[PDB]
Amino acid sequence: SMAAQKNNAPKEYGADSITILEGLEAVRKRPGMYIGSTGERGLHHLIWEVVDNAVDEAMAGFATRVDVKIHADGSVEVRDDGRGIPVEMHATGMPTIDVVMTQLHAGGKFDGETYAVSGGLHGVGVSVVNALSTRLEATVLRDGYEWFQYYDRSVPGKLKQGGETKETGTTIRFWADPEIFETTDYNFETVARRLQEMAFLNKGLTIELTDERVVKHRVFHYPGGLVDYVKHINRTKTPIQQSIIDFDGKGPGHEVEIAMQWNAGYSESVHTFANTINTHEGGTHEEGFRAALTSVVNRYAKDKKLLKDKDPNLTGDDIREGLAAVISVKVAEPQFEGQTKTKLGNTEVKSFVQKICNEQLQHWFEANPAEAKTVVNKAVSSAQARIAARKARE
Amino acid sequence: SMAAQKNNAPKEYGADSITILEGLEAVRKRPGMYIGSTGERGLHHLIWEVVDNAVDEAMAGFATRVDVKIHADGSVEVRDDGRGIPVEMHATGMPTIDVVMTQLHAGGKFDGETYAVSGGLHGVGVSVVNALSTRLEATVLRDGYEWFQYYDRSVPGKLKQGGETKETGTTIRFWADPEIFETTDYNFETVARRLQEMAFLNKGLTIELTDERVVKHRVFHYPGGLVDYVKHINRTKTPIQQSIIDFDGKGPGHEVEIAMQWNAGYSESVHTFANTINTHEGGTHEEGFRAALTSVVNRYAKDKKLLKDKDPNLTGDDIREGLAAVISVKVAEPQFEGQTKTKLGNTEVKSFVQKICNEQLQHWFEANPAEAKTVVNKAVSSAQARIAARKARE
Ligand SMILES: Nc1ncnc2c1ncn2[C@@H]1O[C@H](COP(=O)(O)OP(=O)(O)NP(=O)(O)O)[C@@H](O)[C@H]1O
Ligand SMILES: Nc1ncnc2c1ncn2[C@@H]1O[C@H](COP(=O)(O)OP(=O)(O)NP(=O)(O)O)[C@@H](O)[C@H]1O
Ligand SMILES: [K+]
Ligand SMILES: [K+]
Ligand SMILES: [Mg+2]
Ligand SMILES: [Mg+2]
Ligand code: NA
Ligand code: NA
Ligand code: NA
Ligand code: NA
Ligand code: NA
Ligand code: NA
């Protein structure tokens, strides 16, 4: 109708249509760019960023312990006994801790001088936590003293010098902003799972988790490393072989350890990591591993006549069904996909991991006929049963 | 030995250990944050960023056509007939096009005034393309004239006014930097696949692709939209039902269209989108869809006695085996995971999509017993065959 008609022509698209966000404004306006979502997944990312920085001190050899506490007030506190965040004035004229807390693309991980091998690389993590917290407190033990700083809705207060101490390290306590997050209710089992991974990947490290909100205490320390991680993955799954396969390899700027064992189950349990970061969606290290494994198993099965010349090749899916594996890459110059680091991008890590897996898995299969035969049996007998059922579909 | 021993104690960790990168320096130093990798996946991301901006003009209703050309020199040229990038001086004192090409977190998509619904939201895309190109040229048709700008290793030259024209729009041509990328060899089929998706999702839009490097020409225009996308997905897969299921729903700040059809094959072919962006790793819209579908099929199968009361429930995997589906969400305030936008994060979109799918799929199953029975048969007979084979494993 005439009455319904409105003056609703679109606004002019000009220079003033283009807005520039300040750094921390960009985190608050577009948190998904940095943490994926403002749901449970993104809330936990705040813990990951702070714990990753403590783990980076451990990987450098300075930290031996990470203490994580979820306080009754919903704040998270992460303590390490590493070198401490510098508090001396930065060239920019603020305390160095204020630089990292308030500036994007600021940090000590843009070269290999401070951390040779680190999960950190963007200079963003702790600034995101500050941006998306109503409050952040830091206690740094350095240069013979305690140092205290706080951030009030991301804005620094005045650095305060405390008492004398010979200890060094960093404590970060943050209050996730309820105006950003749909929930601030951390999941203890989610946090325990990730801290357990970090301990399995760093067999010298101890991590302690305490939840004071009204199991509330775990200690994570696994001197048996990736082999014990696979034992843990297979604990509910019934191993179909007595051995855990474990090997490593080294190239210019990169190393890999792989542990793996097949079970009686129908799930793929392949966990991939770079510099302790959980690359949930995989990437070049997982692709190299998968390529090698499918090649070695098919070559072995055909050589040993376990696969008929007629029979189609075993697929990656056929082979990885019932596989538990951990792939841990150490890389001087990681390429991660985004701040959530879901994938390793390094093109050179694909051929490196593929090469080491090809060599080590070919050797293992050749040297272990009884176990190799059971694994090939599993992969075949499954594929064969799946096809016979599919052909009986009416 | 004594001779092997070196003065290799680590450098002091102080204020000068902390470096701040300029914006485009951060893209060149850490391209993975923005494009995932410097391999083939990241190279193609440069095309995606430029084409997404043209698609955003089409979604706003200003552009009708996107022309993509891969030149013999390895440059990519993207033309749209939208409003043009503003060239007038920005408040910051440079031409507005220079602001978007040189500054991170700068753009017209931080509110809904310029673009109501856009894949763009970070103000980063075109600055990444510039940062990772040795050269970028822009031709803007606006205000009665052609305007020309170039960027030389990301640095703007002087904006030049050209001839008169009543036309409006934007052409971007960029030369991917071979010092950043392991390969600059674009894959025609990779580009064709993505442009085809954009056309299926925007049934009024025409996209043309030309490859002049020494099939070299495609036109993408699909007035049949998501229904014709599903027809295309199932073309090699043998539909097991005569219908394509197609429905939509609307809520405050969001809409969804879903088209789906089951086939005789053993693959899941579910493609999910938000504001035309391909959310390859899914997210809240895919989770809502999956939850609804598993609920509706199990409820239907039990109500109709197609599943014995004894029988275990059909799993999501059982149900989605042989499923072709397209989920297209339109959202005023998208939350994407990272600049590669692999996942939709919006918590409210999960319950929205789940609600619409629950209502529309329950209705479709009830109204279409012959097709519903065949789909349940497929899901059961498969699961049943898979289990019988697994139990015959020795
Ligand atoms: N627990 C810590 N101990 C010592 N130094 C730390 C600690 N946490 C942060 N830092 C320093 O602060 C810098 C900034 O940290 P952060 O913002 O998390 O970025 P990053 O770790 O360098 N990279 P990323 O985490 O990938 O964004 C680090 O590079 C260190 O130099
Ligand atoms: N083809 C185009 N036509 C008109 N305006 C454009 C075009 N390309 C870019 N722009 C403008 O330039 C701004 C910056 O673009 P870009 O750097 O890609 O960021 P964005 O599209 O806003 N967000 P994102 O792509 O998610 O980083 C856009 O928001 C528009 O205002
Ligand atoms: K920082
Ligand atoms: K921009
Ligand atoms: Mg960090
Ligand atoms: Mg864009
Ligand atoms: Na009107
Ligand atoms: Na580094
Ligand atoms: Na210390
Ligand atoms: Na030495
Ligand atoms: Na917007
Ligand atoms: Na136009």
Side-chain angles (χ1 to χ4, degrees), chain A residues 155-213 215-249 251-356:
Chain A
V155 187
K158 288 291 137 325
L159 180 79
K160 287 179 59 134
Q161 186 175 343
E164 295 185 88
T165 183
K166 318 167 155 73
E167 282 163 15
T168 54
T170 303
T171 306
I172 302 300
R173 183 171 174 180
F174 66 89
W175 290 255
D177 190 347
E179 288 313 319
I180 293 291
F181 295 101
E182 282 92 293
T183 177
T184 58
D185 193 2
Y186 301 103
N187 185 300
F188 184 88
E189 282 303 332
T190 301
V191 178
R193 182 175 336 106
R194 175 62 183 139
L195 298 184
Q196 178 173 61
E197 292 169 5
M198 295 166 161
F200 275 129
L201 287 154
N202 292 276
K203 66 190 139 92
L205 180 63
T206 301
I207 307 175
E208 182 164 344
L209 175 60
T210 305
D211 190 351
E212 295 192 336
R213 291 175 300 166
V215 180
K216 70 156 279 297
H217 182 247
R218 287 283 294 276
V219 172
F220 310 103
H221 180 61
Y222 306 113
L226 295 206
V227 165
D228 281 1
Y229 191 176
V230 168
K231 284 188 140 152
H232 174 70
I233 296 161
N234 272 347
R235 77 188 169 87
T236 72
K237 294 181 191 289
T238 304
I240 59 166
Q241 61 180 134
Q242 71 187 326
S243 300
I244 295 163
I245 297 157
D246 183 65
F247 57 88
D248 57 29
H254 46 240
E255 295 174 24
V256 66
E257 190 187 350
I258 291 171
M260 47 195 290
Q261 186 187 53
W262 277 269
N263 62 62
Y266 305 112
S267 80
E268 181 170 339
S269 308
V270 174
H271 304 261
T272 74
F273 303 90
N275 301 355
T276 308
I277 301 297
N278 188 330
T279 50
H280 285 284
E281 294 172 2
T284 56
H285 51 161
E286 188 175 41
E287 283 323 304
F289 169 76
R290 286 177 167 193
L293 177 57
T294 295
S295 180
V296 165
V297 170
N298 276 299
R299 268 159 204 287
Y300 182 81
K302 286 186 260 185
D303 183 56
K304 300 305 186 171
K305 285 96 203 172
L306 304 177
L307 261 186
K308 304 172 214 252
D309 291 58
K310 175 224 297 230
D311 279 342
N313 279 10
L314 296 165
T315 70
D317 288 348
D318 295 334
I319 294 158
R320 296 190 304 269
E321 194 186 72
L323 174 63
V326 178
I327 304 164
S328 183
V329 158
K330 291 182 197 164
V331 55
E333 204 71 85
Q335 256 182 25
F336 289 115
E337 182 155 352
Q339 187 66 27
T340 58
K341 302 178 188 179
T342 58
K343 282 198 172 70
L344 190 68
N346 298 62
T347 60
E348 76 281 357
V349 168
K350 187 190 178 286
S351 54
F352 166 65
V353 171
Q354 191 170 336
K355 176 189 146 68
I356 300 303

